[PDB]
């Protein structure tokens, strides 16, 4: 895109999107998951471009030119993101994550605190601890002999039987340059995050300062999954959710207008106190 930059962040050259829009805060900080980059957000960036400053960091070894890097996890993703924000002179921001980018978002909320990061939106992020199929996928990602098979199994799940042209392009073309260095790492980091924090829901509830967080998701589509979101929301005044009804696990791509209205809602709320 026109908006793509690169800067040195501690030891690493990281790319990032910044539309440099001069306007009222908060900045919208779109956070990628593992082994993809800002390209996942291109449609969402267009929905928001005009009214908001939009920043998208890419993680170590991530970007248009993936590279091998030393092992790191979500704690480092958080430090990386804040340093980029510091370099840009961004104070207040609304973080928005995709899938396991949520580990970065929640830890970012903790580290940045409620004045800098008063709310967050998490998109399509498995709220319960891994079921057998996903646990199996993580096991495959970690295997140097079966990692690609692992990614293919996830692509099947994420597409959910749909010939969704834009999401297919993202998975098959826009993730194609990522190798075992990333996918193995993602398997280890995500597996460790669940192991260490229990679940995304446990981690959020354990925040020192709880804050408005909304989970917007299209998948999984089963009633049992909606129920754990409804139950969590019943218990925690600060949590909400919305089932977006898109075909794939990538609503930022396949229902960008819907993702956008939820983001605008939270940004509008922040602007009113
Ligand atoms: C972009 C992205 N990357 C991942 C890497 C490993 C395991 C799960 C994920 C995931 O769910 C997701 O959406
Ligand atoms: K609630």
Residue numbers in the entry: 3 to 275
Anything the authors wrote about it?
To provide a firm structural basis to the observation that the H251A replacement essentially abolishes catalytic activity, we solved the x-ray structure of this variant in complex with the QND substrate at 1.95 Å resolution. Overall, the HOD H251A·QND complex is essentially identical to the WT HOD·QND complex solved previously under anaerobic conditions. QND binds in the catalytic pocket buried at the interface between the α/β-hydrolase fold core domain and the cap domain. The binding mode is unaffected by the H251A replacement. QND carbonyl oxygen (O4) is stabilized by a hydrogen bond (2.72 Å) with the triad's nucleophile Ser-101, whereas its NH group bonds Trp-36 carbonyl oxygen (2.75 Å). The only significant consequence of the H251A substitution is the disruption of the hydrogen bonding network connecting the QND OH group to the His-251/Asp-126 dyad. Two solvent molecules (Wat2 and Wat3 in Fig. 5B) loosely occupy the position of His-251 side chain thereby engendering an alternative network connecting QND OH group to the carboxylate group of Asp-126. However, the lack of activity for the H251A variant suggests that this water-mediated network is unable to sustain QND deprotonation. The HOD H251A·QND complex spectrum displays a peak at 341 nm with a shoulder at 354 nm. Taken together these results indicate that in the crystal as well as in solution, His-251 is responsible for the deprotonation of QND OH group.
